[PDB]
Amino acid sequence: STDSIVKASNWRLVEVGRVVLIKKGQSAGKLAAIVEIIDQKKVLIDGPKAGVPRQAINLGQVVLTPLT
Amino acid sequence: AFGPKAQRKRPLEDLVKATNEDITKYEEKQVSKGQSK
Amino acid sequence: EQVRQHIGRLPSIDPNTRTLLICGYPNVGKSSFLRCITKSDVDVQPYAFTTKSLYVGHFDYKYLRFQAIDTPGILDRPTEEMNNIEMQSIYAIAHLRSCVLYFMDLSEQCGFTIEAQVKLFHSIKPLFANKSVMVVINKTDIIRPEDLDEERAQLLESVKEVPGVEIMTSSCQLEENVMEVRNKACEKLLASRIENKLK
Amino acid sequence: XXXXXXXXXXXXXXXXXXXXXXXXXXXXXXXXXXXXXXXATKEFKGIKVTVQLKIQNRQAAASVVPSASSLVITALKEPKNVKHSGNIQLDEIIXXXXXXXXXXXXXXXXXXXXXXXXXXXXXXXXXXXXXXXXXXXXXXXXXXXXX
Amino acid sequence: MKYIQTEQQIEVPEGVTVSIKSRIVKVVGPRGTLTKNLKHIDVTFTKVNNQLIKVAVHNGGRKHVAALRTVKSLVDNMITGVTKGYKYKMRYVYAHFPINVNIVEKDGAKFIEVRNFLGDKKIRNVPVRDGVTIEFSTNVKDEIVLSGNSVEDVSQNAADLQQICRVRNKDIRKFLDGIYVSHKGFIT
Amino acid sequence: KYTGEGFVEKFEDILKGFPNINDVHPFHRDLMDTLYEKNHYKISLAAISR
Amino acid sequence: RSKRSKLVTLAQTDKKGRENKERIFDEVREALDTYRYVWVLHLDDVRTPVLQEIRTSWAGSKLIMGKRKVLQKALGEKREEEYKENLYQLSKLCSGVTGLLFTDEDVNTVKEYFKSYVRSDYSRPLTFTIPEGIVYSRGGQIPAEEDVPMIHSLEPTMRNKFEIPTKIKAGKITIDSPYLVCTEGEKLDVRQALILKQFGIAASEFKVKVSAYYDNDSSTVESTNIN
Amino acid sequence: PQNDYIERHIKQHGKRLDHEERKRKREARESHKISERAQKLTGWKGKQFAKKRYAEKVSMRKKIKAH
RNA sequence: GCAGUCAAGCGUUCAUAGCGACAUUGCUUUUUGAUUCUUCGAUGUCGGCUCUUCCUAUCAUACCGAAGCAGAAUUCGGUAA
RNA sequence: UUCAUCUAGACAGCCGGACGGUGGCCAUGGAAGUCGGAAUCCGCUAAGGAGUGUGUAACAACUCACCGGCCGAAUGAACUA
């Protein structure tokens, strides 16, 4: 009863190894992994198992998944 | 001459005859038509 | 602009009215005499030149109005040129046609000796023609002037040689003799005003 | 008893000054404090500055002058602006005059103490036509002859 | 320059407990409880372990990071208000007229009533906020003490009480009257 | 003309206000002689009248 | 924009820089082979004629002061780099404000001197109550008939910084309740020391302490504990 | 009246209680108000303010050139 | 206004080929408030009775600010039609 | 954009020192670092100006400019658009 009940506010956060879904574009619905962050908006992704080529991409074209 | 700076500091028996003469002088002293542009 | 800010703060005096001048050396008691005789905010600090301008206070004797003009206190040494603080005294003595209270300290605590007090009184003496001088000894409470030696009391006899003068004893702790000083200051001046009225 | 202290500057003839506030609080003396002051400035000019310190205990007479001040360079002369800008022969005369003042001046030898009394001479003519700053930058006399 | 994240740290001592839902902050400890609403500031709080809590702003400009230091400064004053509490002492110096200060209760509202300020007949009422208790100083001449849990309840109620006695249309170099704040100290 | 009168109405507020040191009284003239230096007093007011 | 505007001045004195540091880097390494004794002295609070006493009293000594890390730079903080040997242990000790001493008279005279040398400075001891009347600049030390009333300029300094309640009737300064500033056996506060500073009460004695000694020819670290 | 009377009233009474707080908090704010007047003062009040603000930068840089 | 002086800037790189803000000096009818009684060609038609409305660049009244602002009075300055 | 200062301790701020010859010459009713004119030099120093400000009738007292103790990452000035 003497604890701090402060909430955590859980967020999917970009990092190296976050797997993502590509919502629009040529690939459009294939999983891929963020390899390296470039800046605030551009990331370097790749998924070779699904078939998306290794490429830079913008974060507006991608949607983050909970899996890591 | 006067103020916050005030550098001047200086301006008996001969002052007696003068100021007694200065005072007695003082009581002796007191006792549009046709123009246009 | 700077002579406008200083000319408002000068005291209001009338030369034709009956005044009295309180003149003497610095650090004597002429400020403390003024504080007990009338209502005025004049500082009583124990150093030489406290008042640098003429300070005026008003009192009442026999249903009238008297004003008491304080002086800054003077050193005569060359008698021709003098400090502008000290020069304000001399025209307050020369022009103002009313009695002057020669305020002498026959005691220890001043910047000057007794011998410097009497020599100045003969120097100012030509200003004292038409003015009916009264001399008042302050600080008599601690010295009791029968202490004084026989030859330097003969200097007090030399004070009484200018025709109209008179000596009184006073202090500034007992408040009845500070009253009795101004009564002879008032009654002697009424001898001069009434005689000038009957002409 | 006790042991207090007072000081006094200026003047040349017997007087009571600035000390009239202290003599009002302390023991009173008008003729005694004037002669105790006149004994200090005896055979000293009244025009020059003279600094003293007076210690009394129930009406004592005291007179001493420390002479660490510009009293030294003012001593070796013969008297809008009274010109103290004079020419004096410092070279050997101020060398012995530096010996009296160097009781502590907190200096190592007279070689680092004679130049400390040279800047105090910011008026006089000294030795030669010039006894000032670079006119006495070095000192090729006395020096070790005072130690 | 678009800082990627900044943070500050809130040092929670052993007495107090802090409950933070979305931006509603409650501080409960020895002397009492407090709340403060923060829906406008748009930050993120994170607990690590029971004595230290990190505030955070991700991807913010210069204005959005300058408003992150002040959220540390508000919760720390919510902490010292509950551990130590606040106490402002005021002196009310008059020149000629004795200033009569009282506490009156009209309708259960507990005002502060000032009379005879510079000879005025006007009665001024200063309302007392919730949670500030005014006591008159014992055996110290001319002193009024304000004290409570909140900074902004106490410091406002002391600032209100000195603006109610401002001298109008006169020279403030001459007329000395007024009420002033001596110093801003803690209780313990 | 309106600016021209604007400077004069300020100057008429100076030359009327100051106490006209000659013929006041030989006392009030002579406190102001020592304290205010009659020469600098009379020259500056006559400069404005010019 | 919206940056802090720094105060710009017009005073005569200017800043030193790095070139005064490297001189003290040289003067310490020069004094090692020149003199024979290395004395390190912890002296936190100092007074300048106290320091100017010790300098002029000892011609054979050289009292060299500076920053700590410059003294570690010159004596050599690590054992691998040092000018003369067996020196890295004694430079470990100088944690406070320290100034090195380089004498050549005796090891007995130096350790005897500082116990014999004692002065008096500010307290930073005995208790003091203020009378409930006119306060004086001596503050009840000497009799108040000879005392001087305090200057009223530092009276707003007293009401705000010293926390002492002073309300002023006339040209002097008055308090109405008796107020004690300190009690004996208590560590004095910085507000309590500044009351004793304005009152001019330096009644706590001062002595300088020394912590270690080195001898060049013997080349060994000597630690002596006197306070 | 009755020569200088405010400076005697300063000595024997004090300025005020918070006269040293308020004055010190003036020039703490005057760094913020000079930038506040330059963004306000629409129409010839922004002209004569900019003429006197530029006359102060010239008068201060001459003192730095002096030494 | 003209004629100087001083120099942060400007002039393809630029002190000295040449410009020049901010300051300041030149007298523009006499340094001691005495006066100057000087209206110096308006070549052109609107002015006033009644009545309404609108700007602010505020003469008064509202509230503030600053000055030797003791009050009393009175100035500078802001928001406001 | 060029110039600087720095993790071997910068910048900010608390804390400590901020001295001796000295109350430097003249000025003066008093002017001691500061109402002022001319000045303005040395000693010891880590550092301490014949001295930026507060102001006592003078002094005292405080301040920064100068160095040093703590804390542990960069920071300041000048401009360009």
Ligand SMILES: Nc1nc2c(ncn2[C@@H]2O[C@H](COP(=O)(O)OP(=O)(O)OP(=O)(O)O)[C@@H](O)[C@H]2O)c(=O)[nH]1
């Ligand atoms: N023993 C004694 N001392 C007095 C007496 N009157 C004044 N004093 C002293 O005078 C000191 C003050 O000096 P002032 O009263 O100002 O004398 P003053 O300086 O010549 O007067 P001003 O020149 O107008 O300032 C006080 O501290 C008293 O000690 C008195 O009657 N007896």
Ligand SMILES: [Mg+2]
């Ligand atoms: Mg006196």
